[PDB]
Write a structure and sequence with these properties.
part of a larger assembly, 6 chains, A mainly beta, B mainly beta, C alpha+beta, D mainly beta, C: alpha+beta, two-stranded antiparallel sheet, 2 helices, D: mainly beta, Immunoglobulin-like, globular, binds a molecule of 3 linked components (NAG-NAG-BMA), viral protein/immune system
Chain lengths: ~210, ~160, ~110, ~220, ~110, ~160
């Protein structure tokens, strides 16, 4: 019954700005031991603020907590690139905790073009019976980018799998890897395998190529 | 005034009124009467050494008084003082027999130092008690682990 | 009735007490073979109801002024009589004077017929 | 310097009983409350329950039937068992110390110390070791990039390191991708200065706990 | 009810006690003229019934475990409260709660008519 | 558990049941409540010095406790110990004020000697008490005539 609804779901704004995260209680809290947590990718959540307003040790003065009984709010003033995380509100009451949906916070920055690299299938991998080509886009922002595979000017749709890292907590940049998986037979047919990249920081598409024998 | 007595019935706490007679309150034996010592940290008081020290002071002209409590709370923060005057003479009295440290303390803050001792005994400036082993005193005894708290008197369920 | 007015409250009570059961594993009641001073205590936890525990903390805060004045009045060093005195006061309230069976100050109820 | 460490089988057979173990170091379990939190991959946190050092327990209303938490003070551990395990119970499982206050610091029942988290995948399928293949371009020489490729493994996760933790800068190890085969596959990369390319050899440190594999693959300099 | 299980029993009890009558021969109640420490006691003998005395010895043996645990729980050096506490417990058993005239836990008997 | 209370009616001794309420048991005044100290020699225990010594030992970590009794039994055999450690330091504490020897002893066995003292206080290994003048202690006090016995609590006839 006690459900904590968090708003907004997602949020993205520039360094220096103030982020206000809200979290409403379904029923009135009978014990105001509210708390806020910051969870970096792959890490357990860190305690930012406990008891509605007391900062945990080692938490910068930017994180400030406040509340009114039904609505509690966390304000991250003067945002810095390291504050990229997902933020949860928490409520301990009547011998049980509840959490919130979470607010994923992206830190903006001026656009940065991807650094494209292409990788031929290795020697031992071909001996196994399957070949995979990898296109790497390193340290770019914004997150949206188009990575188009074309083999001998023939586009390949149905064999590319993409994966993007989480935002870097220092330069606020993303990185992407497009993997083209093919059997050892169909890879033999053609000889030129290239990867074309379009991005907001690229005034013209960048195509990095590798010929079969090199 | 009058020492308040608390009645617990079906997980409901009510203060007994000295004027109002409630026949429903039942006392079948003295084992239902309990004295509890609740520590001040439960009230969220500051527990760091420099902040707790400000809660204690010396005063002459008030003889020490002690009461017993039968149950206490496990304390995360306790204190043990060995304050001495500049000339070297001890500043707190050694605890009399039967007075022992608080039974359950996780962190014991060994407070030491040298300062002027304005009085014969160290009292709690907020009115609380220095809780020892089943004894609540108004005075800090030398070298004995205490935990500042207060005392309540309850008539327990049957 | 109590209501908590303290800044914070720890709604769970982890307690210790000696005034509890002793299963009396043979020869452990004998002090020579009994537990040492640190092991005479039992423990427990009252996280069941948050409200009662917060009420206890306020009661312990409110009894302090009257308890401190009580100690000012008495002259003995240590006062254990307080709990036995409360029991005598309990009996004297109900059975102190003449008890009128149906009266308001008499806890006597006639039989069911 | 208190540290928590969860332990649990990476894969749990469905319709079985699942057991995880939290091991507290540098602090005594006695006197604190200890929580169990689980987090399905890519979703919010769910509180499973808590337990005091004495033994008294209260669990999440929605899960109290399928769960049972236990503590062992002689081993300084807190254990969690989940029965009738389905695919929804696939998550990373945390233990946390929800305490009123520790020493002079007040935490107001906020969870200060957490474990590292243990991922538990619930599937009828079995373990499958990974295979590593280097990532090297056609020879060139500015700033260069290299890495490893980890293909065909199950279940999540696999931890990849570079030069036994010596290389931390500019190391991006990509999240797992679930191929059509049903096995996972990821890749690690690192930008290395092209000048000192041939000075230091570069070796991978992959580790897949569910299948017990920790192989190391070097990368060709091509100075 | 008690039954003696000790190896032997001394069926006669030669006792001493101060808690007895003081005829108060003039000026002997005054401590300055009163008896010295060795002469404040009276004596007596209970050889009348052998069975009661042997029962007392077993009761004194059986109360020892509970009495020793009682002393472990309290913290004061010397405990005189025990006898006054038993009297309070006696009254609280009969007159503690609401008393139903014909009930089993009420020692009230209606008048004879 | 609970300190047993014995009721005496018409030369019949019954133990009061804490759960069973017997309205026939009458307590008109506190003078009907008596505490008796019955000596162990009445139970036929060995009274020679080498055998009684085996009933006492030293232990640290247990604070001494004392109870009062109002009536005692004339003892044929009492003991008075002056044990000291080899280096000469006393091994038993001198009795505090108010604690005096057993009032009525025929034979007082002056026990002396030098032995190792393994603890801070001398306790009774069988659980009995060291009966002094109207005080029953768990600890042997130096130089004071005691008589090992046990204590019963009675509600006497009217
Ligand atoms: C029993 O509880 C009461 C209520 O908590 C305790 O009294 C309070 O003492 C604190 C500490 O001095 C007071 O706090 C201060 O309040 C002022 C505003 O008046 C604020 O500016 C300061 O920064 C500080 O927070 C508090 O006001 C006061 N409350 C009342 C109602 O008097 C009392 O000490 C407790 N007694 C025992 C024996 O524990
Ligand atoms: C209260 O009375 C009981 C019963 O007399 C006392 O307990 C008893 O202690 C004696 C002395 O150690 C035991 O005697 C020995 O018995 C063994 C056989 O078990 C025998 O081989 C030895 O030669 C020796 O006679 C006796 O068994 C034991 N009885 C029971 C039922 O435990 C107890 O010490 C008394 N307590 C007080 C405080 O006086």
């Amino acid at each position: 019954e006690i459900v904590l609804t968090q708003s907004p779901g997602t949020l993205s704004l520039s360094p220096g700005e103030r982020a206000t995260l809200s979290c409403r209680a379904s029923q009135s809290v009978s014990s105001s031991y509210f708390a806020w947590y910051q969870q970096k990718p792959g890490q357990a959540p860190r305690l930012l603020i406990s008891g509605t307003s007391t900062r945990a040790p080692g938490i910068p003065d930017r994180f400030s907590g406040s509340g009114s009984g039904t609505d509690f709010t966390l304000t991250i003033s003067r945002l810095e690139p390291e504050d990229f995380a997902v933020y949860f509100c928490q409520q301990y009451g009547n011998s049980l905790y509840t959490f919130g949906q979470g607010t994923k916070l992206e830190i903006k920055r001026t656009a940065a073009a991807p650094s494209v690299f292409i990788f031929p299938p290795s020697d031992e991998q071909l001996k196994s019976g399957t070949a995979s080509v990898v296109c790497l886009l390193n340290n770019f922002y914004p997150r949206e980018a188009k990575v188009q595979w074309k083999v001998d000017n023939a586009l390949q749709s149905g064999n590319s799998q993409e994966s993007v890292t989480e935002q870097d907590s220092k330069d606020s940049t993303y990185s992407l890897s497009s993997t083209l998986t093919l059997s050892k037979a169909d890879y033999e047919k053609h000889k030129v395998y290239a990867c074309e990249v379009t991005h907001q920081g690229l005034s013209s598409p960048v195509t990095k190529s590798f010929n079969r024998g090199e | 005034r009058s020492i308040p007595l608390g009645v617990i019935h079906n997980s409901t706490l009510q203060v007994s009124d000295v004027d109002k007679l409630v026949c429903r309150d039942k006392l079948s034996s003295t084992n239902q009467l309990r004295s509890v010592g609740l520590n001040l940290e439960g009230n969220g008081v500051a527990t760091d050494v420099p902040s707790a020290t400000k809660r204690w002071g010396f005063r002459s002209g008030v003889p020490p008084k002690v009461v017993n409590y039968e149950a206490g709370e496990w304390a995360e923060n306790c204190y043990n003082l060995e304050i001495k005057k500049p000339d070297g003479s001890e500043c707190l009295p050694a605890a009399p027999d039967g007075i022992r440290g608080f039974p359950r303390c996780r962190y014991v803050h060994k407070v030491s130092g040298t300062g002027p001792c304005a009085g014969d005994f160290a009292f709690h400036k907020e009115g609380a008690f220095f809780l020892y082993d089943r004894l609540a005193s108004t005075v800090i005894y030398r070298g004995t682990t205490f935990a500042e708290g207060v005392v309540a008197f309850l008539i327990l369920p049957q | 009735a109590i209501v908590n007015a303290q800044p914070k409250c720890n709604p769970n009570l982890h307690y210790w007490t000696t005034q509890d059961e002793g299963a009396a594993i043979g020869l452990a009641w004998i002090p020579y073979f009994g537990p040492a001073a640190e092991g005479i205590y039992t423990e427990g936890l009252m996280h069941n109801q948050d409200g009662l525990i917060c009420g206890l903390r306020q009661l312990a805060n409110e009894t302090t002024q009257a308890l401190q004045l009580f100690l000012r009045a008495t002259t003995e060093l240590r006062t254990f009589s307080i709990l036995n005195r409360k029991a005598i006061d309990f009996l004297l309230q109900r059975w102190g004077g003449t008890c009128h069976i149906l009266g308001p100050d008499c806890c006597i109820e006639p039989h069911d017929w | 310097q208190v540290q928590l460490q969860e332990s649990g089988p990476g894969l749990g057979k469905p319709s079985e009983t699942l057991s995880l173990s939290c091991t507290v170091s540098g602090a005594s379990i006695r006197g604190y409350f200890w929580n169990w939190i689980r987090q399905p991959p890519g979703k919010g946190l769910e509180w499973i329950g808590y337990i005091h050092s004495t033994g008294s327990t209260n669990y999440n209303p929605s899960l109290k039937s399928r769960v049972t938490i236990s503590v062992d003070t002689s081993k300084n551990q807190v254990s969690l068992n989940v029965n009738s395990v389905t695919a929804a119970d696939t998550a990373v499982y945390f233990c946390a110390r929800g305490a009123w206050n520790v020493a002079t610091v007040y935490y107001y029942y906020g969870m200060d110390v957490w474990g590292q988290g243990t991922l538990v995948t619930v599937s009828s399928a079995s373990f499958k070791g990974p295979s590593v293949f280097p990532l090297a371009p056609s020879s060139k020489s500015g700033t260069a990039a290299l890495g490893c490729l980890v293909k065909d493994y199950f279940p999540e996760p696999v931890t990849v390191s570079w030069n036994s933790g010596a290389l931390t800068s500019g190391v991006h190890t990509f999240p797992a991708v679930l191929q059509s085969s049903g096995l996972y596959s990821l890749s690690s990369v690192v930008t290395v200065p092209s000048s000192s390319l041939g000075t230091q050899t570069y070796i991978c440190n992959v580790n897949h706990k569910p299948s017990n594999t920790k192989v190391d693959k070097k990368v060709e300099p091509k100075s």
